[PDB]
Design a protein around this nucleic acid. Structure first.
Ligand SMILES: [Mn+2]
Ligand SMILES: [Mn+2]
Lengths: 197, 70, 121, 732
DNA sequence: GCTAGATACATAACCGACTA
DNA sequence: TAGTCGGTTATGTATCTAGC
């Protein structure tokens, strides 16, 4: 369901995208990988041949799409100047930069971008232990400057989370290992609105 | 009390350094003749490897190679 | 004559690092006679043994050891007309000692025992 | 009692004290003596100097030697023990300071040092001061600020300038000295002074048994063939540094990885095994020379078995020369006419025993020179020292037989007052100047150089010439016609050629707005800050909590190396870092860095790094990525990325912490409660909006009944897990 | 109302254990 | 033997308790 613009017929990666359906269609971005995800292409040798192409493409693309990737192929043996100039242009024109060294990698990038349209971020979160004590001592660590030792101290002192939310600021402060700073942080974390007013 | 580093001038420091070095050059060592060591049977029964470490002899190029290692 | 000697303590040999302080400007070491040498270690007998004690009870317990008596806190001692000042430094070199007159191994303490002496009034 | 100067050292010291310069000694000719002479010269509280490249053992030795000498205001070592707020005081006291390099770069850049009161610097091992080093950075900073103190550089090792990588003029410019002083061993003054205080030396050449000769020849021929093949495959590797007689040495390993590491991205299958085979063959040569026979047999059998399992030593181990090696080893240990054994022992042990017998006979009547005198046997490594002790105590026959049986199938107190023999493991690479230390702790009448190198010969020469009236006898044990001899002679030749080239080079040499970058404090174990500062951008170190480099008021760069990037993506850190950078800074940047001594290559399944990178950049649409081959390119990119934007400032970048407020348009929620909520079980990515919008705070979330939770969440399992988590108890 | 010591942690580079 | 993962190490910096 990728609406490839028909301007890149002579591209040796269209043969490398197989795990996904792609069809031609006259759209301004080079590869339209679903809603709010576009793409462009650039082989560094071609960019060397003409230093005006990619600037014109980026200028005329517009600002419609949320994520506008620009994946490029490296072939030449001296990419440092080209990479520097591309990084500057991408920063100034609000598009990310992706490097691939061979057609298979660029095709794999295409496939991943299409297949991951609503994939959750559960892959990148840290493996969190399911042990009840470990879960509680991990949830109370998210506030700054509070470590596992006083976490367990408060655990033994209070036991349940209910009255931990119920107990007041000074009552929190009385416990050992927890001074004014930790008490303020914990009280404000517990008793602050979720929404910003 | 302020530390002496900021207090004392630099020229006085140089003068102190000169005094220290002029003291250093003067501690001349005593000389005695080394009592002889008994002769070694191993010698009597051509230390060119050690005496070549002075790198001051003739020591032509082929002298830096061993025959069996060809 | 004054030269660096070695003392034995049970299974260990400590290699003392003896130094001699000159007599004013004109230096000489001949006054440190051998008769003035041996009884010296008796003055420092107990200390060495104490040192050879703790080390063992550290080695059996499997952890490093610290000096507790070093250059920052030397041992000033008084004898018969001479001063004594003894430290205990680390060496960091694994020596091995064999007594040739009995060709038997003798362990060396892994600490250098530097003592300095000087004549008095 | 200042240290007396040898006859040839007064001229050297006067030359160096007149003008700044670089002093190059012959190997082993007492560089520590000169360094210590200057240290004792500069121990006053009205002048502070800094010493740069020193190991802890050398520092402690110098400090204690000065203490025994009867000096006041000993030098200090500056480490993590003395914290920043307390460091300034020890800088203003004066005297010699042994500070490390991280501490010094930080203190120079943050101006926590009396940089206008520094009087000079002493550099040890000046051949290590190449551009792109921490010490080069320290020198650059000091000279930029002070421009009045002195810089004196010392070095042994005139060979290290002989390699095609480092240049003497380039280093002399890196050190800001501009004057070269050369003091080789064949210099007229040093040789004249040393030839009057020669030690009595006898050198023994011991001949190896015929089977040892056979094994050595087989090994050498195998190695020669392998080197020929490796050279033939790759025609660039034709420079003379990789000849045969240069490939039997210890320093050969490094040089091979100099030529082959860059080209190891495209290297073949075979030439990844010939290099290994070189490694094992050099190891076999060392093993044959140093240790006994049953160990050699065990090592060969281990090689055979490993090749039987994995097939690793295919390029040899089946030729006729390898079979000669095998039959020779088994003829050295076994004898098959139900078994019988021979167990010969290499001649070095017997020669050492004969030497010890002569020494003992001498000591029996030795009374003329006072007492008996002690013996020091210097070996090559701890294994050889232990082997020598076992041999001497047990004897030859019991030692060999017990080693075979193990490896294969079967008075309370007093003065010693007797001569002692002390075995010392030389370890020539680690710290060459350790023999001298031992030579001072236990003064030997006889020294037995069991395994000899050039530096130790020079050190014994100096130790003898330092005491005019006390003699010593040096035995010099070596194998005739072996690799030991060849390595020694090549070292001699290389040293002589290096010094001649240095002298010729010197002889031909006589004829001729402001922008900043707030940098984290954890980033100074790296080359990037130095490369940034070289261009003309000043650095302001500070302990940031978000990001690494702050190029502008709204740009936060986080630097990640390739291995670091993969690990961070796998762990879970990069997600949190990205969320913080996007929360507090408008234009966050992630900079992925590569290593120049490695290919410029980043090398469906969730395990694939590209998949994680795509997911990360899909979730954070405003994140920007930069790719840079090496820090040299990265610094230039950093300069080009701030061409007109305003500069940043500390004391506000340091103030961007958890308690501060987020961007005006980044999130409609309080970061604290929002982060706390997402961690407790029962709330996922999608449902959190509902519990956040239907409820006010965590306290109200605590008071709700399970029916309303099921209502809002829409899932029964999530609601019940929440209700269990919130209202459970520790004792339950 | 004001100051010294000690616990916990953060972080990047480096070395060893595993392992294929 | 070489790639990869995890532990160790050197410097800094809040933060609390005890003592002033
Ligand atoms: Mn960081
Ligand atoms: Mn980083």
């Amino acid at each position: 369901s990728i609406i490839v613009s028909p301007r890149q017929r002579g591209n040796p990666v269209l043969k490398f995208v197989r795990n996904v359906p792609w069809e031609f269609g006259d759209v301004i971005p080079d590869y339209v990988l679903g809603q709010s995800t576009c793409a462009l292409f650039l082989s560094l040798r071609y960019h060397n041949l003409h230093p005006d192409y990619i600037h014109g493409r980026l200028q005329s693309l517009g600002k419609n799409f949320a994520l506008r990737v620009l994946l490029v192929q490296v072939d030449v043996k001296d990419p440092q100047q080209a990479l520097k100039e591309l990084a500057k242009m991408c920063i100034l024109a609000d598009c990310t930069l992706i490097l691939a060294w061979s057609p298979e990698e660029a095709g794999r990038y295409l496939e991943t971008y299409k297949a991951y349209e609503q994939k959750p971020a559960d892959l990148l979160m840290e493996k969190l232990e399911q042990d009840f004590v470990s879960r509680v001592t991990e949830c109370l660590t998210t506030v700054k400057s509070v470590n596992k030792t006083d976490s367990q101290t408060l655990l033994t002192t209070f036991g349940s989370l209910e009255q931990l939310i119920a107990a007041s600021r000074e009552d929190l402060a009385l416990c050992p290992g927890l001074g004014p700073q930790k008490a303020r942080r914990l009280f404000d974390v517990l008793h602050e609105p979720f929404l910003k007013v | 009390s302020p530390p002496l580093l900021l207090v004392q001038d630099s020229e006085t420091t140089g003068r102190q350094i000169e005094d220290r070095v002029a003291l250093l050059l003067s501690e001349e060592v005593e000389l005695s003749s080394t009592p002889p060591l008994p002769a070694s049977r191993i010698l009597k029964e051509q230390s060119f490897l050690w005496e070549g470490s002075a790198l001051t002899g003739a020591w032509a190029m082929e002298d830096f190679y061993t025959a069996r290692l060809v | 004559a004054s030269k660096k000697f070695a003392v034995k303590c049970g299974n260990f040999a400590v290699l003392v690092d003896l130094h001699i302080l000159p007599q004013g400007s004109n230096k000489d070491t001949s006054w440190f006679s051998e008769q003035k040498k041996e009884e010296v270690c008796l003055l420092l007998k107990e200390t060495i043994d104490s040192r050879v004690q703790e080390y063992l009870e550290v080695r059996k317990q499997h952890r490093p050891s610290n000096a507790e008596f070093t250059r920052s806190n030397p041992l000033s001692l008084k004898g018969y007309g001479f001063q004594i000042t003894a430290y205990f430094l680390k060496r960091g070199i694994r020596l091995r000692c064999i007594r040739s007159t009995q060709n038997a191994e003798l362990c060396v303490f892994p600490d250098r025992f530097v003592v300095c002496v000087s004549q008095l009034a | 009692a200042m240290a007396p100067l040898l006859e040839y050292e007064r001229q050297l010291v006067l030359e160096l004290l007149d003008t700044d310069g670089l002093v190059v000694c012959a190997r082993g000719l007492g560089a520590d003596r000169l360094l210590y002479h200057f240290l004792q010269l500069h121990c006053h509280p009205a002048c502070l100097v800094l010493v740069l490249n020193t190991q802890p053992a050398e520092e402690e030795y110098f400090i204690n030697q000065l203490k025994i000498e009867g000096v006041e205001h000993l030098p200090r070592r500056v480490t993590n023990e003395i914290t920043s707020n307390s460091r300034y005081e020890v800088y203003t006291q004066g005297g010699v300071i042994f500070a490390t390099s991280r501490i010094l770069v930080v203190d120079f850049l943050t101006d926590r040092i009396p940089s206008d009161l520094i009087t000079g610097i002493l550099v040890y091992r000046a051949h290590r001061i190449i551009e792109s080093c921490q010490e080069a950075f320290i020198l650059r900073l000091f000279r930029q600020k002070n421009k009045r103190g002195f810089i004196k550089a010392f070095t042994d090792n005139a060979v290290a300038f002989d390699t095609g990588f480092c240049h003497v003029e380039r280093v002399m410019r890196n050190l800001f000295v501009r004057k070269l002083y050369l003091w080789p061993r064949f210099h007229v003054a040093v040789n004249s002074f040393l030839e009057q205080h020669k030690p009595e030396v006898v050198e023994i050449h011991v001949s190896m048994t015929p089977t040892m000769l056979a094994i050595q020849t087989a090994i050498l021929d195998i190695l020669n063939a392998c080197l020929k093949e490796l050279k033939c495959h790759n025609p660039s590797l034709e420079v003379e540094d990789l000849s045969l007689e240069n490939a039997i040495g210890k320093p050969f390993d490094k040089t091979i990885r100099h030529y082959l590491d860059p080209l190891w991205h495209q290297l073949g299958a075979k030439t990844k095994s010939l290099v290994q085979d070189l490694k094992i063959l050099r190891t076999l040569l060392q093993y044959l020379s140093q240790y006994d026979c049953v160990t050699f047999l065990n090592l060969l059998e281990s090689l055979r078995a490993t090749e039987k399992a994995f097939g690793q030593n295919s390029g040899w181990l089946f030729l006729d020369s390898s079979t000669s090696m095998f039959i020779n080893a088994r003829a050295r240990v076994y004898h098959l006419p139900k078994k019988e054994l021979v167990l010969e022992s290499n001649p070095k042990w017997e020669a050492l025993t004969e030497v010890l017998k002569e020494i003992e006979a001498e000591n029996k009547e030795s009374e003329a020179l006072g007492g008996p005198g002690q013996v020091l046997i210097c070996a090559s490594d701890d294994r050889t020292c232990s082997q020598l002790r076992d041999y001497i105590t047990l004897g030859a026959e019991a030692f060999l037989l017990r080693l075979y049986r193990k490896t294969f199938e079967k008075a309370a107190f007093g003065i010693l007052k007797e001569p002692l023999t002390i075995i010392h493991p030389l370890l020539g690479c680690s710290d060459p100047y350790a023999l001298t230390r031992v030579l001072h702790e236990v003064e030997p009448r006889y020294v037995v150089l069991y395994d000899a190198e050039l530096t130790f010969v020079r050190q014994l020469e100096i130790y003898r010439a330092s005491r005019p009236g006390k003699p010593l006898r040096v035995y010099f044990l070596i194998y005739g016609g072996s690799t030991e001899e060849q390595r020694y002679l090549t070292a001699l030749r290389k040293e002589k050629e290096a010094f001649e080239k240095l002298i010729r080079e010197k002889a031909s040499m006589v004829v001729p707005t402001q922008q900043s970058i707030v940098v984290d404090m954890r980033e100074f174990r790296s080359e990037l800050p130095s490369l940034i500062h070289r261009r003309g951008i000043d650095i302001e170190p500070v302990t940031l909590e978000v990001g690494d480099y702050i190029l502008t008021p709204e740009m936060c760069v986080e630097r990640k190396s390739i291995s670091d990037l993969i690990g961070s993506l796998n762990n879970g850190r990069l997600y949190s870092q990205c969320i913080s950078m996007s929360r507090y800074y408008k234009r966050p940047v992630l900079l992925i860095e590569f290593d120049p001594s490695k290919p410029f290559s980043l090398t469906i399944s969730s395990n694939d790094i590209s998949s994680k990178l795509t997911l990360l950049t899909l979730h954070f649409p405003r994140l920007r990525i930069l790719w840079c081959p090496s820090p040299h390119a990265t610094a230039e990119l950093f300069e080009e990325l701030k061409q007109s934007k305003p500069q940043p400032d500390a004391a506000t970048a340091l103030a961007i912490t958890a308690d501060s407020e987020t961007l005006p348009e980044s999130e409609k929620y309080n970061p604290g409660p929002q982060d706390f909520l997402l961690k407790m079980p029962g709330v996922n990515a999608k449902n959190c909006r509902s519990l956040m919008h239907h409820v006010k705070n965590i306290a109200e979330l605590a008071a709700l009944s399970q029916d309303e939770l099921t209502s809002i969440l829409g899932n029964a399992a999530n609601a019940k897990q929440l209700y269990d988590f919130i209202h459970t108890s520790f004792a339950e």
